[PDB]
DNA sequence: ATCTGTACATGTACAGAT
DNA sequence: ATCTGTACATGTACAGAT
DNA sequence: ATCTGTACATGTACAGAT
DNA sequence: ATCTGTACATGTACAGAT
């Protein structure tokens, strides 16, 4: 039913290999260049997120997210305008992207992707292009014609070992579900800062900065469970990746159908199942023959929050993914119509 | 009931301070003499372990355990006599290193320490043969007793009689069992019984288990569900204490052995649910029975090391384990008299 | 001669394949 | 049920540098 | 290399509530 | 009698500074 969907949406291990086999070695050679000269980004480090790394990859493997993160001791975080999720940095290689004493987001990402263009231009082993520059995106987009075609974001991020931002403090609210113990712990691990990079036209524009948990993330994902033997050989499996799954091909599929919802993206559905993960932390409310009613829940929770119009970032409570100033009410409506169809008429979308 | 013999065996806020402060400076003060004065001990670091540093000691903080841990480069290692427990170590005036040797300059090191301290009212306890501590005995007006503990530290993976060790897959889990085995390993200089002979130390991974005990992460967490497991450990110990004052016919018995054997029954029983407060009586009775079947069957495996027997005929006597059978079963058919004195 | 950043060596969880 | 490739963590060997 | 500052877990003690 | 909330105490990991 919903296995048999699942099913279609797992990946094969031939074509996992393929892809990852050329990946890595564009990734590794443009790791390497990132040192490999006096450059301002030497000592930059690879950390793999996303949903390949998580395994909740679904239909191929041609999209890969990674972080060149960078340590930058002596930080001071200054937050614009309360948003809680954007900051502008300030206080050695990064002389050149200063502001008199503010780090430019927009002059570092430059540089980084200039470098990142006159290595891929060196490479005639893959069939391997740097993507046009998006505006509101921190990532330099590498396009890969394997016979099978596979997207890198290759993301730039700042690393602060210092004690999360105050807007934090109330974030990650995983005390009932994971843990007190798991909760500090992750707190000590540091923080990541990735640029901002949009073209609005307001102040600080390219000077600002947006926070990133795509490590903490990772390790949920892969730590899922109230029993620290969720889906270990002796333990129970759940079905909480499962739900994330189908929840993001209906997305997806609904993506690439219809326009009116390109504002919304998978971001969106994984945070909204962190809460559901909170809301409902026993293994046992994950139980793989219940993955219907789960699905089911998951569906209700997310219309609930697009009809109030707000679904808060998991780790920044103020920050309201779902406000009118980045959504419109019309773009929310007409998702809940399309959902609330699917939902009541067997699911038509996951037949195609 | 049980729950008024625990109140008896809870320390003191009070008397925790007091003793903490006391064993703070002088161990403080031994571990600065090992490295800031130029001796073979140079790189040693310190790790609490045992009962109070586990939260399960009882009756008052009279007896610390602290591990001064020293780095040793890539090491050869030769189990003793199939032992699984007992190896001697290969690849500087301790050498094939030498316990015995390492252990008396350690020991004379500390000793020259203590006889220039006029801050408190500290000796040291004349050596016990098969013991690695240097115990140092402390009058505050409280008798209060410190083992200081010498240890190897190899970052190498365990040795092979370790291998089917460790049986947490169904209790903590496959990440946990892997995260752990990847910490390095330590030998402790107890001498087998010769003089050249080190024996493994888990201290550090026991520690990491006490605080770290349920199925659910949230086991004895402020958001979490309380368990009795540390509470049912108590208990025993207790049992055991109790009857070793009175009996000498138990020197032979220690509390290692009933912390092994709850581990064991903590693996047998995993679920939080199975350790609920509201069952501190079943729960205390089913660690009883499990540790009179050990006995009966003379058989208690080192929970880290499989095949090394601490029930073993070599070890302890027939008769010290009929004897402790009767003495247990006696206590447990009537009530537990022995807890009220 | 000694030291070291880099690459290899070892081990295992996760999940896909048989 | 067993087997197998990938990703990821930690230990160690070593050519090139000091 | 050693030390201090910070944050928070695991305790204990006790009052007021259930 | 037990539970819940607060205060008070110790232990411990790690970052940033010296
Ligand atoms: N892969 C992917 N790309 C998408 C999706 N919806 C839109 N896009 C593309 O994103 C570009 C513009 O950026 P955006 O802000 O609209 O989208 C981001 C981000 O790209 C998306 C999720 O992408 P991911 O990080 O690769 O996701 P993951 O690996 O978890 O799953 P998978 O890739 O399999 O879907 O979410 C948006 N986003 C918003 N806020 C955040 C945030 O804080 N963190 C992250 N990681 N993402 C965030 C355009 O090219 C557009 O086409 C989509 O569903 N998937
Ligand atoms: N504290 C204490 N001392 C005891 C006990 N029974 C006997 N002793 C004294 O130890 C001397 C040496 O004999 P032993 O080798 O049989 O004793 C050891 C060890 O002393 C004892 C447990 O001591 P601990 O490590 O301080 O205990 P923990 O901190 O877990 O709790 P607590 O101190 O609250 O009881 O057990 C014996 N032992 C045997 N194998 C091991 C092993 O692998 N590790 C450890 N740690 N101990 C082991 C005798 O002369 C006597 O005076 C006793 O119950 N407690
Ligand atoms: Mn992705
Ligand atoms: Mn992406
Ligand atoms: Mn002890
Ligand atoms: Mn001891
Ligand atoms: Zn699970
Ligand atoms: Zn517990």
Redesign the pocket.
Known sequence: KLKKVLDKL?????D??EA??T??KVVERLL?RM?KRESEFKGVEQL?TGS??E?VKISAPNEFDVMFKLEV???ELQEYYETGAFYLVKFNPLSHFLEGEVLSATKMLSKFRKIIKEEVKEIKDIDVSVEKEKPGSPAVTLLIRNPEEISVDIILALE????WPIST?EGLPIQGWLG??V???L??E?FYLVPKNAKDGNSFQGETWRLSFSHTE?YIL??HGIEKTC???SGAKCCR?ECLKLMKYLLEQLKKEFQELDAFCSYHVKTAIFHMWTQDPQDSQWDPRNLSSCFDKLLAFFLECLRTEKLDHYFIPKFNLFSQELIDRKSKEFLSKKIEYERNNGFPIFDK
């Open positions: 797992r990946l094969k291990r031939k996992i290999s990852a086999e990946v890595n390497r040192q793999n390949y790394y395994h001791p002596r930080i602060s070992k210092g004690s403090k007190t113990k909760r500090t712990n707190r000590r540091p990772k892969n730590n889906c270990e050989s990746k």
